Design an enzyme around this catalytic site. Structure first.
Site, short mmCIF file in Angstrom:
data_model
loop_
_atom_site.label_atom_id
_atom_site.label_comp_id
_atom_site.label_asym_id
_atom_site.label_seq_id
_atom_site.Cartn_x
_atom_site.Cartn_y
_atom_site.Cartn_z
N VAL A 93 0.84 -1.18 0.00
CA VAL A 93 0.00 0.00 0.00
C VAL A 93 0.88 1.24 0.00
O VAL A 93 1.89 1.29 0.70
CB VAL A 93 -0.89 0.05 1.23
N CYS A 94 0.49 2.24 -0.79
CA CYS A 94 1.25 3.49 -0.86
C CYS A 94 1.16 4.18 0.49
O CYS A 94 0.09 4.23 1.12
CB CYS A 94 0.72 4.43 -1.95
N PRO A 95 2.28 4.71 0.96
CA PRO A 95 2.44 5.42 2.23
C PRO A 95 1.88 6.84 2.22
O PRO A 95 2.50 7.76 2.76
CB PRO A 95 3.96 5.44 2.43
#
Lengths: 165, 167, 163, 166, 167, 165, 165, 165, 166, 163
Positions: free
Chosen positions: F45-47
């Site tokens: 998942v993108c931060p």
């Protein structure tokens, strides 16, 4: 508090109208009961409180209310006090002897450093539930009339749940 | 029971005559006190026990007796109740709020499964000693007259030890 | 067992010849003491055990021996019993009330299910050492004369070690 | 107290009229019993206490009362003492030996510092219940005659319960 | 924290639109719930947190989200507060009374030395799972808009597992 | 809750702008702090949440607010993630490594069956008192703007005690 | 095993030909002591174990060795037996009585079931260290001679420490 | 004392002239057994205690008695010693190795400080009951002869129960 | 693990080049030490493991490394084994005897069912810290040469701390 | 000690040749297993210990031996490290993530104050019995060749009891 709790089992000897009888919680089932505690027989103070109650006994018995006075003295002490004091002589209800202190402790009413019960009165309904509690220090008397009023009010509430106000 | 024991220290907020004050045991020292506990503010029940005590508040004050009513509601709730009911409006003594239930528990008067105090009246003398205790189930009612009689008897007994009828 | 052990401290009220007094272990220090326990005041049993000790009382006082009867009743019950019974009215020694049961439990002499003391007599010397013990069930009486004998003997022994 | 309690099971060797026997609580059941404890065999002590019980044994037996003397000595020591002393020789009842101290401890009568039993007498009824106890310090003396009176009194009460005062 | 755990059973009385009802966990099953805790009724503080949530109560209801505010006051106190403040008058969702503090403690949200709940908002899904928690000190304020955004994100995530930005 | 309680002592290694530093509670004294927990580095998942905060870092540093992101990964893992993800690359605040879980447990924020911290954010004042707590399940993002609003409101209240309303 | 350990303190009454004395560990200090235990006085068993020790008593006293017989019977019981048995009257050493059983237990020599010591013999050096132990069931006898050989050899090692082979 | 008690179960590897075997309590059942303990193999002390037992081995085997020597060394250590010492090569009985120390402790014969058994000898009857115990400090020797006398007398009482005097 | 922990005090008797000495932790302080445990003396087992350490002893000594072999046998057993075996005879380092099992338990290396120590080797530094551990089941075999490499590596690291990767 | 004891049950995620899989003790039943623990992913220390085991991997698979490296980092950290380091990219065996530290504590191999596992290798047989253990402090490397040797020897012993 013990308010709204169920009395505990007990088995004590009592002096009632010249006779020695055994009283247990079984004897209280289905009835209204008054447990009237006092410190000691034969003291130098007149037993007016025990006498006041005797004065209303007939009316209490009419209301279906049994009365049990209690001290840590024996039923033998009670028999002797009954035949030696005019006021105690008027007593027709049962005088429970509680030398083991168990009845008194059941009601959390023991002065542990004296081995004597405090001046407390408990009103118990037919299901064994405590509905009124009164405790006073020495010198402050318990009014038998006010006791009558409470018992009547308690009996009302039991018959007319939800005292709409 | 608590008969004949000394009240425990406490610190609660209260509402008294349009004001919010703090009450602690120091406030009771040297005075006679009546702690009047009831279950809940704004209850449909006859605020009859609270009003009658407000009526005899005059005499009580003549006798040097301070009065404190207590419930687990807050002082904020008390203020609001005071200015919404005429019966509660008569109260001129402190209305203590006990949301933590510590005051109620000090007097062993909490209905644990409800978080509400039982209907109980306590008479405390100038040295902090509990001299009289009365607890009743809902609907039974505490007579403020019998209370007054007890207080006067307690005061008489403190002033004249040993003057009770001889057997 | 309690034989040859020292009595424990105690503080109780008593009725003694018309007055209410307080009795403690300090009152026994330096004296010969007889603790006479019994079940209850005002029972239908013959008050003979108590009245007989009373008959030997003057003699016991002559030997420097104090007598204390004990029951779990109060000193008020004792006063009442003393003025209503002729056998008890003879008592001039201290009638100790033990409603808390502490004095009775000190001598391990309590019937726990009755809250009354058993029928036991203890002979205590000036140093607080129990030199004689006698316990009997109801109906079996304690003999005052035999008590007197044991007391004189206890005294001899004290004054003439080994013989 | 031990007063009004039931005696505890026990099993000891005893000397009785020339022979060695074994006594257990079974023998006391259904009988009146007197357990007469003493400190030690062969002691300067005037054996007057044991000899005096002997003097009443015949009458005791006639009333249904067994007697057992007990010391922490062995039953062997009892045989010997019984043959060398004229007072001890008058004894026809069982002389229990309690070297484990068990019997003596059951009656809570051990002088733990000496390993010897205190001078105590116990009256036990047919159901095993202790009805009378007597313990005295060295040199005070138990009266066999008072013991007899107590026993008769106890036997009388067992037969006539609740004997109010006339 | 309680994140991701199932709410515990409870039974409290409440005031909802002029009525007194009983609320339990059964009432939340199959529904999305917001439990809004505040310290005390009748408090001089901006009833701003309670009014804003009442404003967005329309949308919330569109999304199938039930709302329950909770304080250690009783339902009786709630009824009285409801008919004494216009701001509190807007509330049409249940106002739960927690005098025993059991509900407040189930959500580990009690200020023990005050007997009052902390300012905390909890989002609970249809299976009873706590999906979002917010607790703030007095004066900080909880944004009902950010709440709505969270609820919609929670609903989106329940309907479309795995559709988050790829690293 | 941990609301209104004082943070506990801690000592962790961190990765901050190319350097490895040691952080303890001493470093937080006298400052406003944000403890931003997340489960794990390098997931798929993108931060964005960590990036949103980096976007407001400058403004937060202006407000005197230090930021510490935290996961149970090491500071070595953090250094590597910083140089391999454009979003994490933007991070200028300290990235604390908590492999013992002590910092995470201090804040009662450990998923014990995973050994990973939950998605919680804590706002701590200069005296070390927690003033705001936010926790969310996966998928429900934490808005850095709302975080800014709270920190500003908290700083106000500290300067204007008794927000009369 | 109690071999090579130091005897424990003790105080017991004893019968030493004619009179009553008190024995303590002190009486053994700086002296070779032999503790001879047996089950009971006045027993139908031939006192050959006790009387045979008596015989070697002269030789023993020469080597600087004391003898103490021990049984759980009292010293009173001992004096009586010493006057009714020729075999016993031969005894000139102290006959210790151990009714509390502490002496026997100090030497772990008690038949807990009978309250009588077992048939055991111990050799204690001047420093109080047990150098030889011997225990036998009733029937198997204990050799007077052997005991002497043991003591002799025991004393040799005393002055001439370990004489390697 | 372990006198008159029943030996405890055990399983040990042993060296019996040439080969390795396993001894158990079963090997002793219904047989007279003698357990001879000693401190250590390859010791500078003259194996006169071990070899002297060997001599009487023929006579012993006749009486129906088995012999087991025991030390905390292993059976491997035993085989080696049995081939480097004439005195030891004389041994035809089983040389039990007891490295766990359980056999020694079963007989309460361990010098806990050295992890070596004490110099003790035991006599066990067919029912597994210890009838004679002997322990000595290094220096005082254990008599081969006496051991035999003990066994002989021990066996007499075996068939002829208590022969009163 | 015991890895990175300090060895515990100990006091045992040992056989070393013909004489009996006493080894305690005091001797290991300020030195590099190798504790080489094995099951039992006089066993069919190819004494190849001990003989191989002997083969590297000279170089080990040159590096400041003492070696101690340990078995639960006595130091007496070690003397004997040392004179009857050509492989064992090559040993010039101390052969510790641990019959109480204490030393072996300090290194948590006892086979409690056998009373024998497991096949384990421990490298201990001058400050008493365990820097390398190796334990193998019967018949697997420890390589004296790998032990040597490990020791040199540990000595190297003690001198050049934080040796990053080029 | 752990030598000759049976491994405990465990359930962990791992990265293996491009995929995430779950590994449990049931996956080791009936096989020869090597558990190779190390401190941390992405450190500055030479990844040589892991890469060398990889060189001997095909041979180990030929002998029916599985290899599992373990650190307290996640399987995500392992995947990242595998694609950023050339020495790690050689790894074709399972890289187990042990963030809860349970697998590490099973082998009593945790540095409690760091939350990282010590440098330890365990050789486990088909029945789950640990036949070889090797632990070293940092800087002291583990030799893969020596590991191979011990594994072949462990196998011989299994197939030829006593010799």
């Amino acid at each position: 508090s013990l308010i709204n709790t169920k009395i505990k089992p007990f088995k004590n000897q009592a002096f009632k109208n010249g006779e020695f009888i055994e009283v247990t919680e079984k004897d209280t089932e289905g009835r209204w009961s008054v447990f009237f505690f006092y410190p000691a027989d034969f003291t130098f103070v007149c037993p007016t409180e025990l006498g006041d109650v005797a004065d209303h006994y007939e009316e209490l018995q009419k209301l279906g209310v049994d009365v049990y006075s209690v001290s840590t003295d024996t039923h033998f002490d009670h028999k002797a006090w009954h035949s030696s004091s005019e006021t105690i002589a008027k007593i027709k209800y049962a005088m429970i002897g509680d030398p083991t202190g168990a009845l008194t402790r059941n009601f959390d009413n023991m002065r542990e450093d004296e081995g004597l019960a405090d001046r407390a009165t408990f009103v118990v309904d037919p299901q064994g539930i405590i509905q009124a509690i009164e405790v006073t220090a020495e010198g402050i008397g318990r009014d038998a009339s006010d006791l009558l009023r409470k018992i009547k009010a308690a009996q009302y509430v039991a018959a007319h749940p939800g005292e709409v106000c």
